[model samples]
Target: ASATELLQDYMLTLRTKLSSQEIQQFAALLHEYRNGASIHEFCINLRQLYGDSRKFLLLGLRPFIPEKDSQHFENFLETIGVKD
Candidate 1:
């Protein structure tokens, strides 16, 4: 789930940094290649647009988790914070 969140963050960050034309290009490419592509391929496409996935993860999606969750989601938050 963390990895998924990270990937989503990367996509979001890429959306912000890219120009409208570049974003349109990316969207077109995504639409063109999505059918046969694997998850890795999709990630590679994102990396081409944004540079680094890890940076995107830290900057983007990590901040929004709380707002996206419900009060009942506090248990999940506690679970995530537990020491392994």
Candidate 2:
């Protein structure tokens, strides 16, 4: 249940800066992401939803991730041009 666990943690952290409905939307995206959906594709969907605020949402979700998965998450950020 590591993915589910991380999803909870991620959603909780995101809730700090986002509204409940938006958090729910993110939760949907995250579940799909964990289930083998494309991160790049979802990021585009996220951008469509949040527009310019996608950077804020993605960055805000980064720091709390486990170090074991940090690099992959960093790559995710990089894929979206949120990090170098």
Candidate 3:
């Protein structure tokens, strides 16, 4: 699928399967993400997410977020203090 299609589907799934408090927050933030939130804001919110919340979000985000504006997503994880 095209990146556009993939993100569309992933976003839909986020809405359909939003079953937890964190997931709800993720779904909300993802709307802003899709619309182009600043990396600083994204990283700040990402740093505050709980364990599985972070895990689920990043797992779904990897394909779309590998390298944005020459910035490495993995590196963001380090900056955000996400272990594992």
Candidate 4:
């Protein structure tokens, strides 16, 4: 599947598993993330918004990307200006 489709499906699955509040918070963070926010800033915002629970929520979503596609994913992130 296309990357956007894959991301949408992943988010849908996350919605089913997370609380409504968590999902709403994540959506807002995601909007910021998409609009050129740095990962550090995003993480800081997430920490303020979700506390320790942010680690669980973020880590749990990591497995959605297959190992073979990880480099490509990183490259895509870079292309979109999400620098390391």
Best by lDDT: 2
Candidate 1 vs 4: which has more lDDT: 4
For all predicted structures, in order, the TM-scores are 0.38, 0.54, 0.54, 0.52
The number of clashing residue pairs in model 1 is: 0
- The digit string of per-residue lDDT tens for model 2 on 11-84 reads 77667766788877877886786677765666666666566665756775554455666676677778767765
**Clashing residue pairs, candidate 1?**
none
Q: Please, what is the whole-model Cα lDDT of each candidate in the order they appear? A: 0.49, 0.67, 0.63, 0.60
Report how far residue 25 has shifted in candidate 1, in Å: 2.6
Tens digit per residue, CA lDDT, model 3, 10-45: 877766655588677876776687688866676557
Which segments of candidate 2 are over 4 A away from where they belong?
Answer: 1-10, 63-81
lDDT by residue (1-84, candidate 4, tens digit) is 766776788788777766898788888877876676666566556556555443344543344445654565455444434443
**lDDT-sorted candidate list, best first:** 2, 3, 4, 1
lDDT of 4: 0.60
Per-residue lDDT of model 1, residues 1-84, tens digit only: 576676676668667777787668666665655455443444445456555433333234333334433332333333333212
Query: How well does model 1 score by local distance difference test?
Result: 0.49
Q: Which candidate number would show the highest TM-score if scored against the true structure?
A: 2
State the displacement of the C-alpha of residue 59, model 3, in Å, after optimal TM-score superposition.
5.3
Off by over 4 Å in 4: 46-84
How many clashing residue pairs appear in each of the predictions shown?
Answer: 0, 0, 0, 0
| Models sorted by TM-score, best on top | 2, 3, 4, 1
Q: Model 1: residues >4 Å from true position, as ranges?
A: 1-15, 53-84
